[PDB]
Amino acid sequence: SNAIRDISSIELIKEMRFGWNLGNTLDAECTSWMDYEKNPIGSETCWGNVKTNEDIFKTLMDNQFNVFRIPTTWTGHIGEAPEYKINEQWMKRVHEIVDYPYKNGAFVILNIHHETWNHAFAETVDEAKVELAQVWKQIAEEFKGYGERLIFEGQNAPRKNGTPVEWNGGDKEGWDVVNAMNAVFLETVRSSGGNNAKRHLMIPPYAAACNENSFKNFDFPEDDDKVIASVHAYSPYNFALNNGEGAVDKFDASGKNELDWNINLMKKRFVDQGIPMILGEYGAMNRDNEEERAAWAEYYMEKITALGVPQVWWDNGVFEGEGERFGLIDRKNLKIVYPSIVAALQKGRGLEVNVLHAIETE
Ligand SMILES: OC[C@H]1O[C@@H](O[C@H]2[C@H](O)[C@@H](O)[C@H](O[C@H]3[C@H](O)[C@@H](O)[C@H](O)O[C@@H]3CO)O[C@@H]2CO)[C@H](O)[C@@H](O)[C@@H]1O
């Protein structure tokens, strides 16, 4: 089945309800202690998530999720330079997981994620561009026959890791590198075989940041209507993403102001300019505050739905402890842990509320 619809991204995006990330899974990176030679697909579970199965996705699809992002870290599974051959058992497992939502008719986003080699520094950009082309040549070849519901996202949050400008929008060095890398990704996939000339491709601004500086220095192609801007927006910060000092457990007036500001940024940079965009990651972590988060999620969803922009929940499988607690589905037991959040996504999207597989009330 190698058919692909010839459809613009803006038209295709209309078919998207809302999404879910298979977080802390194929993106988990454990090369400091795991032997990837003896465990070539072991990294999937090395951050504590269960082995992925189709029923995780069917549980979510029952709740009207129809976009599934598969964040994938290829670092550790890549052969030596300059061929950068991807381990074939790893590629097969990535392929099995893409197929869980894809063969059930949903949208799938496959990316490159926690890579050590695509950092946004001019020092290494010549080498990083070669590795990016080699990696995407192989991904594009493996999935060349897939239709329009399989989307490639060329980079995740390329940035100047470990610098003062890592998380505040970047600087000119970082913007030029991210743009050059995005161009290599687009060219590599467009130049490849099969349906890839008509595949929908996502590219991020620097760090995928919802930021004035990142947005303003983001190059976007003017002659390719099947390219999509990839943005991440865990907004407002202290309520949604702050895992240290200053975190708040209520979505208050100042938090709404901050969220409204960033949504308006997306409107002015992308929506008003006819640039297709997807919020590929967002979420608010568990602070024993499900109703605060449900109200925030319904408001966020309603506002971006009025702009035609879909969003994709970041679910890293973590519910308690010191880590970031973005879990939404209990993958082991196939239960929605926060049913009022899922109800908020449905209601805010304009859908009928029907939360299936909810956990019992304790
Ligand atoms: O517990 C296992 C490891 O967790 C690592 O933290 C991860 C968070 O749990 C996860 O929520 C976060 O998700 C990122 C996403 O990958 C990224 O694309 C986006 O820019 O931000 C999201 C929210 O922060 O990923 C991190 C990994 O970077 C710990 O860092 C690690 O020590 C620990 O072993």
Contacts of 151 (CB under 8 A, 6+ apart): 107, 108, 109, 110, 199, 200, 201, 202, 228
Cα–Cα dist 38/141, whole Å: 26
Cα–Cα dist 173/175, whole Å: 6
Tokens for 52, please give them: 């992925």
**232 CB near ligand 1 (under 6 Å):** yes
Measure 323 CA to ligand 1 centroid, in angstroms: 8
**3-state secondary structure at position 141:** helix
Q: Which of 20, 33, 47 to mutate to test the pocket of ligand 1 (most atoms within 8 A of CB)?
A: 47
Provide long-range contacts, Cβ within 8 A and 24+ apart, for 331-339: 331/49, 331/50, 331/52, 331/56, 332/50, 334/55, 334/56, 334/59, 335/59, 335/359, 336/59, 336/63, 338/286, 338/290, 338/293, 338/294
Contacts of 93 (CB under 8 A, 6+ apart): 26, 41, 44
Q: Is 277 left (phi over 0), alpha (psi -120 to 50) or beta?
A: beta
CA distances from 230 to 51, 62, 203, 234, 248 (A): 27, 26, 5, 13, 27
Give the technique used to solve this structure.
Answer: X-ray
**47 CB near ligand 1 (under 6 Å):** yes
Measure 9 CA to ligand 1 centroid, in angstroms: 29
Measured from the Cα of 208, ligand 1's closest atom is: 20
CA distances from 90 to 93, 149, 185, 226, 249 (A): 5, 22, 21, 28, 39
Query: Crossing angle of helices 88-102/125-142, nearest 10°?
Result: 60
Bridging pattern class, strands 67-70 and 311-315: unpaired
Cα–Cα dist 13/278, whole Å: 8
The total number of residues written for the chain in this structure: 362
Task: Please spell the DSSP secondary structure of 178-234, one letter per residue.
Answer: HHHHHHHHHHHHHTSSGGGGG--EEE-SGGGB--HHHHHT----SS-TTEEEEEE--
Query: Crossing angle of helices 290-305/253-266, nearest 10°?
Result: 30
CB 227 within 8 A of CB 186: yes
Q: Tell me the resolution in Å.
A: 1.8
Kindly state the DSSP code that residue 265 receives in the 8-state scheme. Answer: H
**24 CB near ligand 1 (under 6 Å):** yes
Cα–Cα dist 296/22, whole Å: 22
Cα–Cα dist 24/314, whole Å: 9
Cα–Cα dist 53/145, whole Å: 23
CA nearest 67: which of 11, 151, 144?
151
**157 CB near ligand 1 (under 6 Å):** yes
Place of tokens 């949504």: 263
Kindly state the DSSP code that residue 270 receives in the 8-state scheme. Answer: I
Q: Which of 285, 324, 326, 328 to mutate to test the pocket of ligand 1 (most atoms within 8 A of CB)?
A: 324
Cα–Cα dist 24/46, whole Å: 9
Cα–Cα dist 15/124, whole Å: 39
* Residue with CA at minimum distance from ligand 1 atom 2: 47
The H or E element containing residue 21 is: strand 19-22
Cα–Cα dist 282/305, whole Å: 14
Measure 24 CA to ligand 1 centroid, in angstroms: 7
Instruction: Give the number of C-alpha atoms closer than 13 A to the C-alpha of residue 151, restricted to the C-beta side.
Output: 30
Tokens for 32, please give them: 């400091």
Q: Which of 211, 314, 315, 325 to mutate to test the pocket of ligand 1 (most atoms within 8 A of CB)?
A: 314
Cα–Cα dist 338/353, whole Å: 14
Measured from the Cα of 283, ligand 1's closest atom is: 23
Kindly state the DSSP code that residue 275 receives in the 8-state scheme. Answer: -
CA nearest 20: which of 335, 326, 303?
326
